[PDB]
Design a protein around this ligand. Structure first.
Ligand code: SF4
Length: 211
């Protein structure tokens, strides 16, 4: 692949969807942090169904703490691992109240310190709630980057590091959401939708499927 081809792929993804975002519903950084903590081994539609019940009754660290571990579990019992999720939620709300004064902190090490949130999660929250140029790589973005040859790599860290070198600064805030929505709905794992792909003539995959 090369610089000019990469730039035309990013130009077509912007034309198609100028402002890509998460499929998790949220109206605040805190509501995004909790939705992302509820995401582990669950679908976005499962999480949105649970937060549609929960956030009208408690959507601040203080209201959440007042609901308690067992009150939280009542609203999220439909989601996988909800007992440990409910513990991580209450603990994170306490830390935000004490150390960060009821705010979600705009800082990677502070977010990574929170129970249940790791590097990829901190990067997704900094990008999606605060607009940071971070580009977290999951299995979808890994498959898309290697199939197209946009940013090939042998594991997650190599693709993440290549993406931070090859994506122009202009495109780095929307890059993660463009590539994950492309992987989820077009460049899917079993039988890619190549005959209907908006970047098919720029993609370098040798096994394209419906011409
Ligand atoms: S042409 Fe096929 S392999 Fe290439 S990006 Fe599109 S869907 Fe994926």
């Amino acid at each position: 692949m090369n610089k000019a081809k990469r730039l035309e792929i990013l130009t077509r993804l912007r034309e198609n969807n100028p402002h890509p975002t998460t499929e998790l519903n949220f109206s605040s950084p805190f509501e995004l942090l909790i939705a992302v903590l509820l995401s582990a081994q669950a679908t976005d539609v499962s999480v949105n169904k649970a937060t549609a019940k929960l956030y009208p009754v408690a959507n601040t660290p203080a209201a959440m703490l007042e609901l308690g571990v067992e009150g939280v579990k009542t609203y999220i019992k439909t989601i996988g691992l909800y007992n440990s999720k409910a513990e991580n939620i209450i603990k994170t709300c306490r830390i935000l109240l004490e150390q960060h004064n009821g705010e979600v902190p705009e800082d990677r090490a502070a977010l990574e310190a929170l129970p249940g949130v790791g590097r990829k999660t901190a990067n997704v929250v900094l990008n999606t709630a605060f607009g940071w140029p971070t580009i977290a790589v999951d299995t979808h973005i890994f498959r898309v980057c290697n199939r197209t040859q946009f940013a090939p790599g042998k594991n997650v860290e190599q693709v993440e590091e290549k993406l931070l070198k090859v994506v122009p600064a202009e495109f780095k805030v929307d890059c993660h959401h463009w590539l994950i929505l492309h992987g989820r709905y077009t460049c899917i794992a079993r039988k890619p939708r190549c005959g209907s792909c908006i970047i098919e003539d720029l993609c370098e995959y040798k096994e394209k499927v419906d011409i």
